[PDB]
Amino acid sequence: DTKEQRILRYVQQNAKPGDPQSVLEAIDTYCTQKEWAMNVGDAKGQIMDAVIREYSPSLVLELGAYCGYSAVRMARLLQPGARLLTMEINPDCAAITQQMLNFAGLQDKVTILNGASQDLIPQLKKKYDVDTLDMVFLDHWKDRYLPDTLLLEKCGLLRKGTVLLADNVIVPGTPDFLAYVRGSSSFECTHYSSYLEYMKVVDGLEKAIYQGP
Numbered sequence: 001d002t003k004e005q006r007i008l009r010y011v012q013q014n015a016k017p018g019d020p021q022s023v024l025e026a027i028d029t030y031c032t033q034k035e036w037a038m039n040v041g042d043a044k045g046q047i048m049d050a051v052i053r054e055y056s057p058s059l060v061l062e063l064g065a066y067c068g069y070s071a072v073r074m075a076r077l078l079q080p081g082a083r084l085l086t087m088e089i090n091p092d093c094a095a096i097t098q099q100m101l102n103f104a105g106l107q108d109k110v111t112i113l114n115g116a117s118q119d120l121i122p123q124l125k126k127k128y129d130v131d132t133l134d135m136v137f138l139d140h141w142k143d144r145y146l147p148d149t150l151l152l153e154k155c156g157l158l159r160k161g162t163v164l165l166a167d168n169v170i171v172p173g174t175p176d177f178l179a180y181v182r183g184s185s186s187f188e189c190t191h192y193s194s195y196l197e198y199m200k201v202v203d204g205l206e207k208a209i210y211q212g213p
Ligand SMILES: O=C(NCCCOCn1ccc2cnccc21)c1cc(-c2ccc(F)cc2)cc(O)c1O
Pocket: 038, 039, 040, 063, 064, 065, 066, 087, 088, 089, 090, 115, 116, 117, 118, 139, 140, 141, 142, 144, 167, 168, 171, 172, 196, 197
């Protein structure tokens, strides 16, 4: 089996069904004690929680699900009826994420999409009946942060006040995205310094709030 399957089986055998906080704890314990993996992790997760609670978004788009850690983290804080759409290009990871969400009891809040962001973003309005997004969590290929931000805008998916929250802006890094949003009058940007998941390595989140054209 793969690392991702081992993480899912660990959660199934060490967390309580229907209890999202147990699922996050189990993932973080496994990835601290057994095998590192690219989940957002608890240090950066606690900053995500504070952002989610400040904005109480009704409709969130995540780019990059992986094993569903960030999807569990955000969906557990959504208000009743609020929704998360999460895009995952790797079908094995899409299947782990669906199973992780099932286990956590969050499957009615989340729709796990299996494809590439550049293919799926243009289908959001017609196929997933999206008007505009309240928040976007960027956690996919780091060289896609910037092009997908611009594609979201092209597609009319951003509105005044949509919150972009970007993982890994330091490690691995997203230098073009950072320079762009920080330089642009169309974004109001804040950096939250933290640590790479499970490591004593500096990383950070960027929040970039869209201000319209
Ligand atoms: O690579 C990372 N994430 C991206 C996964 C592929 O995403 C592909 N992907 C997922 C949906 C999706 C939709 N469209 C396109 C590609 C799409 C990633 C990497 C590291 C990391 C840090 C230090 C290291 F030494 C090694 C790795 C940390 C992270 O937190 C990450 O998130």
